[PDB]
């Protein structure tokens, strides 16, 4: 072991606790310069050391490697190493320094770097475990172009001049992701000559106030403060009269508030990239801002912004390609100035005041149609779905959802050959589902027609909808047999058909459905038997592509009226508020809404969440296969014809919470298996043949009587007891 080799031999026996892939395993006692991950000058010095992505697990002391006198270059990122150079030490010639992707947390180490570290170029410091707060800036190092310290644990505040301290220059640096807080006003930028971009996006910055000095950097292309506190207004005057080069500006999710300043406007000889969103803004973009021609992508969603301006502004900007103005205040029709833009993918109007018609004139010219997905849901819109919207081959989303709308759904729309959700629910949409559906047009993974008029049979087509993970049918007008083909939809996740005419049996064939979590068929005219096959998934569901979507689910204290009242709907685009005017709200009202992304409840081996049949003429037995589900926590087969006895098997129902066997023929007696179902809280037994003892174990003696009330003999707590 002399020198050099020493050194490197130090770090494999002492920094590296696992090289389970023996990445090391060339370092060995006899020349260094041959070993993996090592690289050296003509001096046969070492000028470099990379070790990215490894799997090497440790304790980094920076300091013990930096003693190299020659090496230029580090990369150690995409590992386990913990702590990290600290200390203080020996010369550091580094001119590249990547460390991001471990789990170093000292920032005694950043403290080394920035100070003795002269010659570095760039420091990736970037998804680690840093905690504790900004020290003084590396203004010795004077070839510092890059700094990234994101996605840390920092708090406290950035000092007052800590950038304006930083070398001269210095063109990137990244805070996002940390725990900074303190007044965003308080920081000084000095001269920020080299300074292109400057991100403090997700932090805890506050004020009334932008800083003074920010106007300083001069050739900034990209300033986020995203996600912050900031609150007041955005600066007018002339605060943004200097920024010659502003590419990308987010001022998105803050406090701030008044209306838009017509100075902004200023950006505009450069600005691709507006986000505005997540504030209290009012009023309108201002005139000024059609000088906006490179404008590329403007999200204004979240504001109380309104008036003209997407006519009068954003119709002349003919190059904007994603246009966000959901959850505002804009009246009056859609502007169909909006469909001279010829590069528009996106268009969200979503929660907002629009009347009128839906836009007849999206693909026009062609040449060709560009837009993916037109979202105009919780408005007012009123007339029929325009059969021109089947011009736009590129269509990949429809959302219409919550609107005044009316008459058929045009075939055109279902015959767009890219077509992927077709979201409708709650209008007055009329006719049936065609027979060419999925084969005829795009292969659909979400169709939401919940809450409209529609008539006729669910189309034996559906079966070649292979893509299909969520279907919402219910409180329609259709009638006839739940297709056997529905089977073939192995992605099938939520199937939605309650409150209809439906009739004949459930097929079978549900329970090849592999992905099938939730099963609502209450209110409908179903016989026959329940199927065995519902079961079979059992323990084999694997989480699917149904999570990440925006749902609502409304609860409500009822009750026999409030069944088919709220429960579980789409609710991309569309404000809590106007859940109220759903059906039945007065019976009904909404004692809790819960909202958010969906998230399966289960890793992996799952079953059925929700499975309701409640208020059908099913007869037959209980299939004792059903109380395999382990993470079915509603089982509502209520308002039936059911036969035979409770399967004791349904003590395997540990994630239960409702179960609801009430009104139909059941006989015998209580499972007291039932007992050990620790999660019960809603228990409806009532209006059955049972007798005997109600189980004394878990749950059953906390029900109210009314839970037992009109069986065939029943006792024991909260009954008269058995030994009467
Ligand atoms: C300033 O700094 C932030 C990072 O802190 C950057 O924001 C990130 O943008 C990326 C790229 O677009 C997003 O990743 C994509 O996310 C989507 C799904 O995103 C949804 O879910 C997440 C999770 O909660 C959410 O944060 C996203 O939020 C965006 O969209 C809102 C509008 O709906 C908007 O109000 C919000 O500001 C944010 O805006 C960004 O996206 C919109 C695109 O709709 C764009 O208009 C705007 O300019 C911003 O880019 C959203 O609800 C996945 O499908 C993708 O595959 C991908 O992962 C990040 O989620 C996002 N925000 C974060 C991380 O907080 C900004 O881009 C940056 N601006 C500049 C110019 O540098
Ligand atoms: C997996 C998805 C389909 C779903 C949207 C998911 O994201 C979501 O977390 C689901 C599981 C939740 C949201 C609201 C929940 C229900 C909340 O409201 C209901 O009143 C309660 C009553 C009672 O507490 C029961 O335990 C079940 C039950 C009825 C819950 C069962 C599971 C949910 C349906
Ligand atoms: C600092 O390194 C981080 C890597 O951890 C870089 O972030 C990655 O960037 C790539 C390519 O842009 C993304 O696709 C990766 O997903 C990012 N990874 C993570 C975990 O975010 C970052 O680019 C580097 N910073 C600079 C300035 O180069
Ligand atoms: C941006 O950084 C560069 C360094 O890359 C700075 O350039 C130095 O500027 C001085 C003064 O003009 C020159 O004498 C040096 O020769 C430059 N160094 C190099 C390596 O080119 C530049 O000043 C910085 N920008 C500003 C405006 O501060
Ligand atoms: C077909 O299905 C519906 C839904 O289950 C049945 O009816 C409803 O009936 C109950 C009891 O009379 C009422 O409380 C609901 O308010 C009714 N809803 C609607 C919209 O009608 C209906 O009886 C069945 N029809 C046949 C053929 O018997
Ligand atoms: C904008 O819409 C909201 C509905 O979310 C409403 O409360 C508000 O009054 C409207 N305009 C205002 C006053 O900001
Ligand atoms: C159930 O369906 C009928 C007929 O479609 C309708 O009048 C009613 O609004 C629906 N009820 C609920 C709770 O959605």
């Known amino acids: 072991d002399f020198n050099e080799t020493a050194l490197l031999l130090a770090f494999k026996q002492n920094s590296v606790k696992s090289d389970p892939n023996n990445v090391l395993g060339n370092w060995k006692y006899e020349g260094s310069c041959s070993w993996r991950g090592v690289s050296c000058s003509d001096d046969g010095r070492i000028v470099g050391l990379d070790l990215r992505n490894s799997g090497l697990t440790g304790t980094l002391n920076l300091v013990n490697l930096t003693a190299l006198p020659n090496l230029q270059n580090l990369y150690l990122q995409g590992n386990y190493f913990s702590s990290g150079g600290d200390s203080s030490g020996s010369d550091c010639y580094l001119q590249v320094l990547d460390l991001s992707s471990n789990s170093i947390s000292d920032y005694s180490m950043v403290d080394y770097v920035f100070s003795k570290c002269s010659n570095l170029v760039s420091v990736n410091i970037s998804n680690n475990k ?21 996605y840390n644990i920092l708090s406290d505040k950035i000092p007052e001049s800590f950038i304006s301290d930083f070398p001269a220059s210095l063109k990137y640096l990244d805070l996002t992701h940390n725990n900074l807080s303190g007044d965003f006003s308080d920081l000084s930028f000095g001269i920020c000559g080299n300074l292109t971009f400057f991100s403090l996006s997700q932090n805890n910055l506050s004020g009334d106030k932008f800083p003074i000095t920010l106007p300083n950097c001069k050739f900034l292309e990209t300033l986020n403060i995203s996600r912050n506190n900031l609150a007041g207004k955005i600066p007018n005057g002339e605060y943004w009269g200097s920024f010659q080069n502003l590419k990308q500006l987010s ?11 017509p100075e902004l406007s200023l950006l ?6 507006l986000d505005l969103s997540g504030n209290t803004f009012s009023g309108e973009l201002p005139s000024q801002f059609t000088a906006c021609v490179w404008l590329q992508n403007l999200n204004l ?26 959850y505002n205040n804009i009246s009056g029709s859609v502007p169909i100035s909006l469909t001279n833009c010829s590069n528009l993918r996106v268009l969200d109007l979503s929660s907002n005041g629009f009347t009128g018609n839906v836009p007849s004139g999206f693909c026009s010219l062609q040449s060709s149609p560009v837009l993916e997905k037109i979202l105009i849901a919780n408005n007012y819109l009123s007339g029929t ?30 015959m767009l050959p890219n077509l992927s959700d077709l979201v409708m629910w709650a209008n007055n949409l009329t006719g049936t589902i065609p027979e060419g559906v999925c084969v005829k047009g795009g292969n659909l993974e979400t169709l939401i027609l919940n809450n409209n008029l529609l008539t006729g049979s669910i189309p034996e087509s559906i079966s070649r909808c292979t893509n299909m993970i969520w279907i919402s049918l219910s409180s329609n007008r259709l009638t006839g047999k739940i297709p056997s083909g529905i089977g073939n939809l192995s992605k099938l996740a939520i199937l939605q058909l309650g409150n209809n005419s439906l009739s004949g049996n459930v097929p079978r064939q549900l329970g090849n459905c592999k992905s099938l979590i939730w099963l609502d068929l209450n209110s409908n005219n179903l016989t026959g038997d329940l199927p065995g096959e519902l079961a079979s998934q059992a323990g084999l569901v694997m989480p699917g592509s149904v999570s990440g979507k925006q749902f609502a689910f409304v609860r409500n204290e009822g009750g026999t009226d409030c069944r088919g009242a709220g429960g579980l709907v789409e609710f991309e685009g569309i404000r809590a508020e106007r859940l109220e005017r759903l059906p039945m709200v007065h019976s009904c009202p909404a004692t809790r809404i819960y909202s958010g992304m969906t998230m399966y409840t289960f890793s992996a081996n799952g079953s059925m969440i929700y499975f309701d049949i409640s208020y059908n003429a099913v007869s037959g037995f209980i299939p004792p296969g059903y109380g395999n589900m382990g993470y079915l926590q509603v089982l509502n087969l209520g308002h039936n014809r059911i036969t035979g006895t409770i399967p004791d098997s349904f003590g395997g129902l540990k994630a239960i919470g409702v179960l609801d066997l ?4 059941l006989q015998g007696y209580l499972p007291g298996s039932l007992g050990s179902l620790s999660f019960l809280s809603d228990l409806d037994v009532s209006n059955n043949n049972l007798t005997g003892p109600i189980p004394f174990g878990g749950q059953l003696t906390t029900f109210p009587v009314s839970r037992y009330a009109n069986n065939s003999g029943l006792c024991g707590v909260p009954l008269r007891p058995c030994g009467s």
Not at 251 to 261: D, T
Not at 301 to 326: E, M, P, R
């Open 268 to 273: 505009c000889k450069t600005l691709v990239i």
């Open 662 to 665: 009430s009104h139909n023929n």
């Open 251 to 261: 001022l998105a999710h803050n406090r701030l508030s008044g209306e838009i300043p």
């Open 130 to 150: 840093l905690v504790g707060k900004l020290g003084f800036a590396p203004s010795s190092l004077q070839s510092l172009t890059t700094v990234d310290l994101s």
């Open 301 to 326: 969603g979240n504001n109380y912004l309104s008036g003209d301006f997407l006519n009068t502004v954003v119709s002349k900007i003919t190059g904007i390609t994603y246009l966000y103005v959901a």
């Open 385 to 414: 779905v325009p059969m021109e919207l089947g011009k736009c081959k590129s269509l990949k989303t429809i959302d219409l959802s919550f609107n005044e709308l009316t008459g058929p759904i045009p075939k055109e729309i279902w």
